[PDB]
Design a protein around this ligand. Structure first.
Ligand code: ZN
Ligand code: ZN
Length: 392
């Protein structure tokens, strides 16, 4: 058969566990959670990277649904609960295709049934409002990872896309990691500074994840993972779930964005200004200089390198679909994963290497977090510490 044909067959047995999809935020922003207006049992290709038919076509067998909220607005906890409610309602509307999953055993149950295991991951520590009880409440509601920051620092952790703050994790930051370990919530080090990565790896007694990051050696962006951190993953037992964001996998796209940003500032605009005035400026840039386009091969180059540095047992996939406006050719929406698996086959990746990449590493890591949690929950009670107490 072709490599594509083979990829599809492999994915039927060991499907993709995708680590990060922002469909809930996209539904919030497009239709304020009116789910009939973006029904995923219908074709939503005009509006979204995701719907049920494309997930099936893509070989997705489990999804960490992001319950991301902005870190620059008040009421982040309320909005996080609204994000979680969005995911719950989606599961309840599509029981034929989706199955709530809280544990590694739930994931396997879903695979056995042919339903897509639906998990939740919070995207940024601001979602807990400096409160360990709030962290515990998010776990209770089903959240099974938390990205320690989003694009901004928070009071106790530094972000990759902000200036240095506390130097990685503060004392409270370390207490958050310890409580995540006790609860069994996976520590997600996507979006955080390299300092934060190393401090988390020092502190954590459970395997950690990167739910959507690629390789800083291949594409130099602070959103990507340095080799020294990748090297620490086998000892930690965790995994890096490669992402498709073109400016994190193609060096030319990083360079292009950096030039776009400079051009915006040269016109007196913040690089994120979205005003129509700012927009005409950017339009003129893009007309002078076309945006470079990443491909499936770009992403495979990351996986080859990450495999060499971290090891095949420490890899997964996290597309960032409905979380990023641009995508690589061949990976335009959630139906694309077989194209990536076929490229890897063409590069000589074995069937067991690919079963680990797609399914088994993710299941292992969540099981390990549950195992660590069993031991810590038996060993001590939950923390009542506050940020004032530990950080001043
Ligand atoms: Zn993200
Ligand atoms: Zn996101």
């Amino acid at each position: 058969m072709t490599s594509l044909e083979k990829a599809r067959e492999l994915l039927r047995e060991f499907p993709v566990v995708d680590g990060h999809n922002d469909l809930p935020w996209a539904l919030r922003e497009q239709v304020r959670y009116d789910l009939d207006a973006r029904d995923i049992a219908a074709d939503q290709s005009a509006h979204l990277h995701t719907d049920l038919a494309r997930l099936r076509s893509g070989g997705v067998g489990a999804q960490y649904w992001s319950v991301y909220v902005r870190s620059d607005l008040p009421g982040a906890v309320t909005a996080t609960l609204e994000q979680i409610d969005c995911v719950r309602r989606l599961i309840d509307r599509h029981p034929g295709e989706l199955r709530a999953a809280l544990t590694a055993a739930d994931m396997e149950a879903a695979r056995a049934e042919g339903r897509i295991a639906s998990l939740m991951g919070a995207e940024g520590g601001h979602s807990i409002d400096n409160s360990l009880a709030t962290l515990r409440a998010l776990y209770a509601l089903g959240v099974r990872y938390m990205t320690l920051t989003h694009n901004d620092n928070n009071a106790w952790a530094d972000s990759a896309t902000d200036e240095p703050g506390v130097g990685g994790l503060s004392a409270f930051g370390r207490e958050v990691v310890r409580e995540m370990n006790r609860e069994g919530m996976l520590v997600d080090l996507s979006h955080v500074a390299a300092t934060t990565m190393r401090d988390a790896l020092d502190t954590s007694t459970a395997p950690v994840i990167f739910s959507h990051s690629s390789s800083r050696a291949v594409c130099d962006h602070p959103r990507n993972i340095p080799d020294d951190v990748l090297e620490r993953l086998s000892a930690n037992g965790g995994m890096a779930m490669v992402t498709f964001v073109p400016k994190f996998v193609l060096q030319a796209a990083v360079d292009w964005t950096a030039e776009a940003d400079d051009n915006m500032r040269a016109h007196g605009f913040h690089h994120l200004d979205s005003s129509p005035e700012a927009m005409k400026v950017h339009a003129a840039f893009e007309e002078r200089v076309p945006r470079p386009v990443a491909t499936v091969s770009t992403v495979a180059d990351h996986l080859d390198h990450m495999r060499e540095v971290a090891g095949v047992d420490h890899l997964g996939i996290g597309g960032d679909y409905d979380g990023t406006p641009f995508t690589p050719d061949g990976l335009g929406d959630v139906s694309g994963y077989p194209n990536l698996i076929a490229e890897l086959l063409d590069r000589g990746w074995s069937q067991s290497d690919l079963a680990k990449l797609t399914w088994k590493n993710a299941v292992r890591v969540l099981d390990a977090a549950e195992d660590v949690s069993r031991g810590l929950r038996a060993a001590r009670g939950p923390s009542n510490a506050t940020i004032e107490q530990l950080d001043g």
